[PDB]
Each structure stands twice: as C-alpha cells, then as structure tokens.
C-alpha cells in the first residue's frame, strides 16, 4: 500500500480517457484493467477519489453493448460500493440511474453487481432511496421478482422493503 496508491493515481487519468474512447475494443481493455485495479484497497481508494474515473465507469456501464465491458464496469462499482467514499462517488456520479438500467440486463453477473450495489447504496447512502425511485427503480425491481433465483429474489425483496 502507498506505493500501490501512487502507481494507481498516475495511471488513472489515462485510463479515464481510454474508458471514454469511441473504440469499443479499447474501452473493454481499459475496463478489464480498471476492474483489476479495483480489487486492491490502495488503488480502489485512488479510483474512488477520482470523479472523472467514476463518471467514465458509470457512463461506460450504461452505454456499452459489450457484455464483458458491462460486467467489468458493474463489478467495479460493486467493489467501490463497499466503502463509504465509494458509495458517495457512485452517487454523485449519476451511478444510480445507470445501475437501475442494468436491472434490465439478460446477463447474470451484471444483474448481480447491479442489484447488490443498489442494495449497498439503499442501506448506507443518504439520498439513495429517492434517487432510485426517480430512476423508476421500484418498477424495474418489481419486474425482476418472477424472473430470478431465490438469492436475487431475497436481495431484491430487501431493496423493495427499503423503498416502498
């Protein structure tokens, strides 16, 4: 740690611009990397300290058509959501409506990261309940209830008890 921290901070601006690229091969690779970075606490802290990086992850998650890119950027928000500062950064970045949109994904890992991140925001982040409602999150959550396994159902039922 601390070495790792500064290493990340140096790379973060360029990763940001690559994540924002128009070429989806480039986006994908930069997303894999950002996801791998989010696995170590030091560099996870440098990701969460960068509004630009957080906004690029949110925007990519939401606009992408590549399954793997949606997975890795959703996974990354998931990892940030384990920290109070991560939650706040997702929230200020517009992460909530992106995450609610990923509740329509036919992909299991993505649904998974989206519902758990939303759960962590609903539990711990002031302002999250209203912003999930504003994004239509109650209906999108209710649409999943007959469509998922009993573990997703349980988490989603809990998000709903938080919101109703």
């Amino acid at each position: 740690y601390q070495d790792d921290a500064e290493l990340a901070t140096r790379a973060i601006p360029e990763l940001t611009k690559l994540l924002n690229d128009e070429d989806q091969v480039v986006v994908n690779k930069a997303a894999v990397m950002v996801h791998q970075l989010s696995k170590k606490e030091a560099s996870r802290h440098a990701i969460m300290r960068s509004p630009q990086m957080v906004s690029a992850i949110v925007r990519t998650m939401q606009n992408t058509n590549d399954v793997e890119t949606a997975r890795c950027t959703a996974g990354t928000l998931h990892n940030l959501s384990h920290h109070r500062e991560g939650l706040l950064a997702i929230f200020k970045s517009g992460g909530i409506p992106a995450l609610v949109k990923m509740l329509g994904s036919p992909v299991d890992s993505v649904l998974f990261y989206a519902i758990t991140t939303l759960h962590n925001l609903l539990l711990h982040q002031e302002g999250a309940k209203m912003a999930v409602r504003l994004a239509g999150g109650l209906q999108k959550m209710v649409a999943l209830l007959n469509k998922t396994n009993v573990k997703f159902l349980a988490i989603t039922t809990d998000c709903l008890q938080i919101l109703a």
């Binding site: 290493l7 990340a8 140096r10 790379a11 360029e14 990763l15 690559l18 690229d21 070429d23 091969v25 480039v26 690779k29 930069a30 990397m33 791998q36 970075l37």
Partner: peptide, 27 residues
C-alpha cells in the same frame, strides 16, 4: 476485421500500446 479505416486501426494500435504500457507499470 471490424472493417476499420486505417486511421481507426492506427488509433486502436496506439491505444492498445498505451494500455500495455499501463499494464506494465501496474504489472
């Protein structure tokens, strides 16, 4: 392949190289 123009193929290659540079720095 994706039927990129040469200008797109050049941008793809320079971006992937920088990514390899960053992957190297981050090991």
């Amino acid at each position: 392949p994706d039927g990129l123009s040469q200008e797109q193929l050049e941008h793809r290659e320079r971006s992937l190289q920088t990514l390899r540079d960053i992957q190297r720095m981050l090991f």
